[model samples]
Target: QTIQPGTGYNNGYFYSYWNDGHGGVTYTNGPGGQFSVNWSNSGNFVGGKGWQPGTKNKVINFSGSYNPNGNSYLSVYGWSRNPLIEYYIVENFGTYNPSTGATKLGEVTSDGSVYDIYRTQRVNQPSIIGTATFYQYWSVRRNHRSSGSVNTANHFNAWAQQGLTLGTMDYQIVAVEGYFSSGSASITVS
Candidate 1:
């Protein structure tokens, strides 16, 4: 059976969540750190597997087949506490680039590519800490591709260098996000 619009967890390590917009979104938990998400037009669907976490010297190797339309991205997405922040490590996108109107603070080079780091805000919107205003940190890659290796520690260090820091670590995931569009993806994180 497929999961829709909810969250699931295993050993506090592997997790899954999805919120459907206009149409329907289905999520399937695969073997180990693998997951699959499929969706179509309606409103929006953000569905994927929640990853391990953020910590010191963490490197994630991932692969996926991404088919997206409208506005979507394959991202390492999560939240943080204390100050309450939402962050995105955007790996790939379909049409609209994620970095449009945000303040481009700096850049970081990892996995043989450059990512533009930025800081944006969601005013009085739904967040991990409820519906409240919070900051969103972004690391959008210049050359967007679906499959690669993410040395998360490098980006975390870059954000800290630019004064964009996170409070406490929260649940992070390799996500397939679709906003006013439709998409499908199969991914694995380790």
Candidate 2:
């Protein structure tokens, strides 16, 4: 849903969900705006800033903080459609066990930081393109931090160098996601 300036529940870009849990996002006013999330018991929580569709050549500069209070992860992640793919650029501030079926894909450095990457797929999971098996490329920070700016193109190039193919960008999202169980997580982006 379109997010207007306000301090209301579930008021922000768009909210996508699965059967695991529920959450909402709040966005503030202005050019360099900020946003926050309140989620619980979410198996695959996706919430926060989003941008119009564009190509990989476009650079996305974003800084945010993931503050957590339980068994969950506050991550800087995004998704693309066409062929249905997802990208996780940073997962920090808590515990995150990559999917058991995920294949370790070494590491890559971007935005002056290093990340241990992985590739995985989820079948029958919900997404912007409905229920279909989607590929996920995860580049988790080797050294966890709470806030930073990410050069989207840099991460995309790193994956391409490793022979990973992604479809044309549908949208770029900066979100704080939670997985399996319950917890309180907050994300501030500007």
lDDT (Cα atoms) of all candidates against the true structure: 0.78, 0.58
Clashing pairs in 1: 22-42, 22-43, 23-42
* Model 1 poorest 10 in a row by lDDT: 11-20
Top-scoring candidate (TM-score) = 1
Each prediction's TM-score against the native?
Answer: 0.91, 0.74
lDDT of 1 by residue, 5-108 (tens): 76667433456575644656667778767888777763666666655456535676678798986788888887778869888889989888888987789989
Candidate 1 C-alpha error for residue 73, in Å: 0.7
Q: For candidate 2, write residues 1-190 as lDDT tens digits.
A: 3343222223343333223333333323223334555544444555555454545765444555455555455455667766678777764646545544677777778766787777887888767676788888877777776666767677788887777778867656565555554544444443
Candidate 1 Cα RMSD (Å): 1.8
The residue ranges of model 2 lying beyond 4 angstroms of the native Cα positions read 1-32, 40-43, 91-93, 99-101, 181-190
For model 2, the run of ten residues with the poorest summed lDDT: 5-14
Scored against the true structure, residue 31 in model 2 reaches a CA lDDT of 33
**Native-to-model Cα distance after best TM-score fit, residue 69 in candidate 2, in Å:** 2.8
lDDT of 2 at 45: 51
